Amino acid sequence: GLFGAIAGFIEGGWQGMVDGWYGYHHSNEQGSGYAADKESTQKAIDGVTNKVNSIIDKMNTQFEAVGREFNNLERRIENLNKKMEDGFLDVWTYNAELLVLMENERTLDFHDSNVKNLYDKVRLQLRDNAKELGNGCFEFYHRCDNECMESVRNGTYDYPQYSE
């Protein structure tokens, strides 16, 4: 990826999380489980939905079709007519194929950016109070029960705590 996260410092995807694109896996004294981050999953949904719509709508007034007849002594204008309809056909075909290639690339790197932004939302919260495992995981320097985990997930984590 372009942002280093997806298939980068986070080596693989979670077949286990089905509630969203980006999320968490916690492991504490009350057990394990997956949890999707709705705030960033929904935002990414709005984004690529707008992307799809902007593509469809920008190309509604394209080039049309109409057939035209020419007699045997009108070969020049018949050829002109063919060449210009094939012309617009080619540039619109190029315009659609190129647009898809370009945006598909922005979209993949968009997801890669969202994950990296999520990892840092947590990292910038658990400052001293945890250590970077280097693989997308954070080891806690204390006990983080299910209420505490939620404080990390919804961005209300409290730093006023010791850690050693």
Binding site: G23, L89, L101
Partner: protein, 321 residues
Amino acid sequence: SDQICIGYHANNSTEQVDTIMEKNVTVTHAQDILEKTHNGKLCDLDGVKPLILRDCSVAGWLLGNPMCDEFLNVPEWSYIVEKINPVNDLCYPGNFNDYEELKHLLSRINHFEKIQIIPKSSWSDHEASSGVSSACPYQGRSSFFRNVVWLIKKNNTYPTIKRSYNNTNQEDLLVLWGIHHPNDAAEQTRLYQNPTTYISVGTSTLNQRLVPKLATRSKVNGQSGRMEFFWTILKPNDAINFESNGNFIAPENAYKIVKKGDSTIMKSELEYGNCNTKCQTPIGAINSSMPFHNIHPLTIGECPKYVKSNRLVLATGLRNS
């Protein structure tokens, strides 16, 4: 020891997309946006049936080639279908002047009502019922284009004609007529006594004078003579004036333009499928919500945008492994 991990979705999707830097990239979710499927049929366009000329051309239809009687009084159409090379065209060989311009006009028309403009009974001093040919057979016997009349001499005389018609209708009027080019002076005098003939036609805009061309030509449909046809649009309240001392193929029926609208002439060998569509092509109809298709450039109705790609797939989800 307690810990929390940040990660992303993954599934069993095998769907790929392309990027500028990488082809065949498997992702979690994708969206196809290219329609590649058609029903292979010619359908009604929003409930209104197309006009399917069968083995008839536009010329055969409008002039009234006897083989095209099916289209004598055609109902409203959505579009027109014509074969690449219709068998029933000009039964009596010749040419139709400004044919492509007339076909173009047809693409803006949805309905004619054919009216009789000059009755066959009104030809007091000529034969209006002897103008038939083996080139134009109907049920085993000689005939002719139904909407015009091939007038000939009566009692070895062809009085010069002065006939005129005022378009008192609210509609534009499509008027057709022609001139006969014989193969020799003998044929000339035998059909129309007068050896040196002309046809003059006038309207507000038209100032025409035709004279027959005698020449030796190869037989087409068994004839070395030629019929050359002409058309004009008669404006409401305008009149058309014919004068002629021979070789005149006179109007009998004309066409009131009673519905203008977007239409087209499709070249297609397909026949009427008994379906309805919102989007038609010469090789079949399209039922789709895609923003693109790759079926055919020539299209009518509420359609996706045509494109030459055989694959267009957008990425929605992230890279899958």
